[PDB]
Structures are given as C-alpha cells and as structure tokens.
Amino acid sequence: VKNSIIWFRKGLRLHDNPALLEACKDAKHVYPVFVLDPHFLQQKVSVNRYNFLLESLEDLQRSFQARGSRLLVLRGKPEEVFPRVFREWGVTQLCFEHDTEPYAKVRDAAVRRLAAEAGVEVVTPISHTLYDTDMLVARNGGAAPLTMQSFTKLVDRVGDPPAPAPDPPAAMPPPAEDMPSAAPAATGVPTWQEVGFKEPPLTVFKGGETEALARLEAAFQDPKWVAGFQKPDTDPSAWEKPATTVLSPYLKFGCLSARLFHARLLEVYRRHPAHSQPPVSLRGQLLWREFFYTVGSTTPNFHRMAGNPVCKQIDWDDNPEFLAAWREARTGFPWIDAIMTQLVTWGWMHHLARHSVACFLTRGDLYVSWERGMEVFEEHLIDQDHYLNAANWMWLSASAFFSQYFRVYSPVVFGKKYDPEGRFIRKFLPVLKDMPAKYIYEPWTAPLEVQRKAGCVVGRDYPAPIVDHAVASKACIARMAAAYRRS
C-alpha cells in the first residue's frame, strides 16, 4: 500500500502545497513531519523568530487535526531520524518543497540518498518561489540576470507563474496507530520555554498560515491601495498601521504562498489599469524576492564578501565599539536607536527603516562590514531570509547591485520628513517621550534646562552621538570612492 511522508521545512501551510497533495494521493496513511533539532540553541536565534516558527507549527497541528490527522514534530537530525521511520512506517513516498539555500542542498541530497537505499520515491515540487529559478537561469542563456530590469524582462518573456495549487482534501489519511516514533509525547509542538529560552517573546506578529491569510485579506480590503502601491513612497515611521503588508515573515516560512499572493495581485490589476508596475509595485516586491533568490542560489559564497564573485572587496573596519553601540541601540541618534529597538522588540521594520540603519553602520557613518550587520539582523528579524538579508546588505553597503555611494541617508533629517513630532521615536525610546519635537531627532542640541524638564539629560539618560554625521559621512564617502577606483 502507499504510505507517505510530507516533510515540512518551509511551506508551513496547506494551501498551494503540491507536495502534500501528492503525498495524500492514493495514500493509506500520510505522515506529516517537521524535524526539530533539540540543541539548535546550545551551539544566534531570538525567541521572537523561534516562537513564530512554533506558532506556525501549532497552526499546522490544528489544521491537520481538523482533517483527521496530526502533525509529528520529530526530535533529531533528518539524516538520523528518516532511515528509522522509513522502515518503521513502511514508507513508499517522501514529499517536500524544494529549497535552494546552501545547507538545504547538502541536507536534501543526503536524505535523497537514504530514501533511495530504502526504496522510497522522492517528490520535490517547487512552490516557495514564483518560478523554478533554475528554469529562469536556463532561459536566460545559463546565467542569472544581475539587474532587475533584465530580470523583469526575463519573467515577462517566461509568462505568468504557475497557479496556486488546489486545496487538500477535507479528510486526510492519518498516521497508523501505535507506531512508536509517532507517540504523542515525543511528537508534539514544544513551547518557547521548553526549547531553552528564558525571556518571553515580545513581537506583535503571530505565526501561522491562518494569520497569514487573514493579513492577506486585510491588504486586499482596499483594491485601490493595492493597485497604486509604490514601495519608495511608503512611510517607515508608521507603526500603529505599518505602511506595507508585513507579509514578509509569513512568506519566509511559507505560511503564505507567493503564488497565491501573485494570483491575487493580477486579479486586482486586471480591474485597475493605472496600477503601478515593477519595480515599485507590490508585484514588483515579489519580484525583488525572486531576483535575489535567483542570483543568490547560483552565486558561490553569496552570504560572504571574500570569495563572492558579485561582491566588491572593501576594506571595512574591525571596530567592535561602533558595532556594539549600533547593535545595542546606543548610538545617540534616536532615529537609529529607535529602529534598532524595533528590530529587537518586534523583529520587523519597514524597508526604509532598514535602509537607515544599514547605511549608518556601513558606507555612511561607521564603516563596519555589512556581514556584521547581517549577523545582527539574522538573530532578531522574524523575516530573516538567507538570500534576501544578504543581497539587501550588499545593496545598502554599495558592495553589490548598488553603486551610488554619494547618496548617504542622514540619521537626523531622514525620519523628520515623515514624522516631525517623532511619534515613532517616543514609542520605541520612551526615555525621550517628553522631549520637545524641536530636539527629539538631535537631543544633544537641547539646552540643559530643556533636558532636565523632559527627564532626558544627554549622557545621563540617553547617550551622546557616537559620531558627528557630517565628519563621518565625508570620511566614509572618500574611502568608498578610492575603492571604486581600486576595482
């Protein structure tokens, strides 16, 4: 008979899941599996991101229980757990969504070898990306496009991405009873307390497919907003209602299908003819993701400077003091420190807020490597994605895809244009809550009498600027200009 495993790694969803539909097909028993390494901590990851994963698994659990089945969270490494359960469960087919990340390729190969030894058929559909990213490279003549203009041209030549896959059946073949490796007490979803985390998650975005589809429908409640979306014109200071979709954590874990999102965009575009076009449109934002997945998956050492054929070799400074101040939100520049606090508190910041902090640490003020910034973002972002985090840090550091190092964001003026009263700053830096708006972006300029009334004396309650932006940016630009002459 047919006994199948659907292995979740990403794709933590039941919609547009071609691997689950194939697994459930003609199956006597389907085994829904997530593999959790119980020592991933003891070895880098925030409770905000890890708990979002756990909430995503608890949603999957509820969804499978509704359909007569059960999510099995196996503890161990895939290479050691799958050979046993292949034979324990009499598995004939193993299904999972294809992953193009470097560690994914090594892991999936070894598992595919194990499945062959056990007589197990492997089916690996593509669904995390709009397209088969290797088909895009082959249609482009064997190399990934290196500009979005050429990439947008390529996808339009290829045509619409595949349609979202149908929904799974209302009743699923369950695991077989009294299998020892599927015992309930060994296969449940743990809490954040039981994985070793001692401080609670604080983010306001809840994990799971059910919340991802609720947040999708919220975005599409105003079609005219979807149609006219222009990414560079949105507001980074907006926190009560963020100015973009905040679907990124759900797309990263696959709680939301990229293809379903794309299909819903085109239906709105069909009825709104003046709709915005790539790159600034919402569809364009999914294409930024695909562009970076396509380049990054075909580029060696993509997450690194050294050995990376697309990254400029820049002489960044090893300055732990500047880095530490940036990471711990104590630069003395409230726009920067507020954004870095939202990072550690919510794990999500608007795209231009990320611009402001990434420029500051790299080609604008502190001249620290974008790798040191990417590592900090990897720990705290709930949307952390190998290829998107790496390419946007190379972009922001003018090390790849971007070359206009004379455009330096001001850590004082940038946010002021959107939020003159500093509502964003007061929310995330309550120490400045009583600071008059005239000084809230430059508190070191306030007379001492003003500092004492507001309760924020610089050097006592809030740090002093670690640099003079005018001096620092002028130095950093000079150095960047000599490097671009050096290459």
Ligand X SMILES: Cc1cc2nc3c(=O)[nH]c(=O)nc-3n(C[C@H](O)[C@H](O)[C@H](O)COP(=O)(O)OP(=O)(O)OC[C@H]3O[C@@H](n4cnc5c(N)ncnc54)[C@H](O)[C@@H]3O)c2cc1C
- Binding site residues, ligand X, CB under 6 A: 231, 244-248, 251-252, 285-286, 288-289, 292, 350-351, 354-355, 358, 377, 381, 383-385, 388-389, 392-393, 396
Please give the size of the binding site for Cl ion, defined by CB under 5 A: 4
Phi, psi of 216 (to 5 degrees): -60, -50
Site for Cl ion contains 31 (CB under 5 A)? no
Instruction: Output 69 or 410, the one with its CB closest to Cl ion.
Output: 410
Among residues 382, 386, 381, 356, the alpha carbon closest in space to that of 371 is found at 386
Q: Closest approach of Cβ 221 to ligand X, in Å?
A: 14
Checking DSSP bridges between strand 72-75 and strand 93-95, what pairing results, if any?
unpaired
User: Which H helix or E strand runs over 229?
Assistant: none
Among residues 327, 412, 332, 340, the alpha carbon closest in space to that of 372 is found at 327
48 is in an annotated binding site: no
The entry of Cl ion, ligand X, none that residue 56 binds, CB within 5 to 8 Å by partner kind: none
The residues with which 29 forms a beta bridge, in sequence order, are: 3
Q: Closest approach of Cβ 321 to ligand X, in Å?
A: 22
The entry of ligand X, Cl ion, none that residue 231 binds, CB within 5 to 8 Å by partner kind: ligand X
The entry of ligand X, Cl ion, none that residue 358 binds, CB within 5 to 8 Å by partner kind: ligand X
289 is in an annotated binding site: yes
Q: Contact region for Cl ion (CB under 5 A) — 126-134, 223-231, 402-410, 453-461?
A: 402-410
* 256/39 Cα distance (integer angstroms): 28
Instruction: Output 120 or 247, the one with its CB closest to ligand X.
Output: 247
389 is in an annotated binding site: yes
288 is in an annotated binding site: yes
The entry of ligand X, Cl ion, none that residue 245 binds, CB within 5 to 8 Å by partner kind: ligand X
272-280: list long-range contacts, CB under 8 Å, 24+ apart.
272/223, 272/224, 272/226, 272/227, 272/228, 274/227, 274/228, 275/226, 275/227, 275/228, 276/227, 276/228, 276/229, 276/230, 278/148, 278/152, 279/148, 279/152, 279/231, 280/229, 280/230, 280/231, 280/232, 280/233
The entry of ligand X, Cl ion, none that residue 172 binds, CB within 5 to 8 Å by partner kind: none
CB 33 within 8 A of CB 365: no
Q: Contact region for Cl ion (CB under 5 A) — 2-10, 64-72, 403-411, 468-476?
A: 403-411
Instruction: Output 181 or 298, the one with its CB closest to ligand X.
Output: 298
Q: Closest approach of Cβ 380 to ligand X, in Å?
A: 10
What secondary structure does DSSP assign to 271-284, as a single string?
H-TT---TTTSHHH
380 is in an annotated binding site: no
* Last residue before each gap in the chain (C to N over 2.5 A): 43
Q: Closest approach of Cβ 231 to ligand X, in Å?
A: 5
- Numbers of helices and strands, H then E, in the chain: 20, 5
* 371/375 Cα distance (integer angstroms): 6
Q: Could you give the residue ranges of the DSSP H alpha helices within 298-434?
A: 320-327, 334-346, 351-359, 370-380, 386-396, 413-416, 423-428
Q: Closest approach of Cβ 297 to Cl ion, in Å?
A: 34
The entry of Cl ion, ligand X, none that residue 410 binds, CB within 5 to 8 Å by partner kind: Cl ion
351 is in an annotated binding site: yes
CB atoms under 10 Å from CB of 205, counted, come to 21
* DSSP reduced 3-state for 31: strand
Instruction: Output 24 or 352, the one with its CB closest to ligand X.
Output: 352
User: Which H helix or E strand runs over 22?
Assistant: helix 18-24
Q: Contact region for Cl ion (CB under 5 A) — 258-266, 339-347, 356-364, 401-409?
A: 401-409
Measuring CA to CA, how many Å separate 130 from each of 127, 260, 487?
7, 9, 35
- Which amino acid makes up residue 246? V
Site for Cl ion contains 410 (CB under 5 A)? yes
Q: Closest approach of Cβ 234 to ligand X, in Å?
A: 7
The entry of Cl ion, ligand X, none that residue 355 binds, CB within 5 to 8 Å by partner kind: ligand X
Q: Closest approach of Cβ 260 to ligand X, in Å?
A: 13
Measuring CA to CA, how many Å separate 369 from each of 198, 312, 333, 394?
31, 12, 20, 10
290 is in an annotated binding site: yes
451 is in an annotated binding site: no
CB 39 within 8 A of CB 192: no
404 is in an annotated binding site: no
Site for Cl ion contains 346 (CB under 5 A)? no
Q: Closest approach of Cβ 317 to ligand X, in Å?
A: 19
256 is in an annotated binding site: no
The entry of ligand X, Cl ion, none that residue 383 binds, CB within 5 to 8 Å by partner kind: ligand X
The entry of Cl ion, ligand X, none that residue 288 binds, CB within 5 to 8 Å by partner kind: ligand X
Q: Closest approach of Cβ 71 to ligand X, in Å?
A: 25
* 487/484 Cα distance (integer angstroms): 5
Binding residue (CB under 5 A) for Cl ion from 205, 370, 414, 439: 414
Q: Which residues, including other chains, have CB under 8 Å from residue 362's CB and lie 6 or more apart? A: 316, 368, 369, 370, 373, 393, 396, 397, 398
| Chain residues in the site for Cl ion (CB under 5 A) | 409-410, 413-414
Q: Which residues are annotated as a binding site?
A: 231, 244-248, 285-292, 348, 351, 354, 383-385, 389, 392
Q: Which residues are annotated as a binding site for FAD?
A: 231, 244-248, 285-292, 348, 351, 354, 383-385, 389, 392
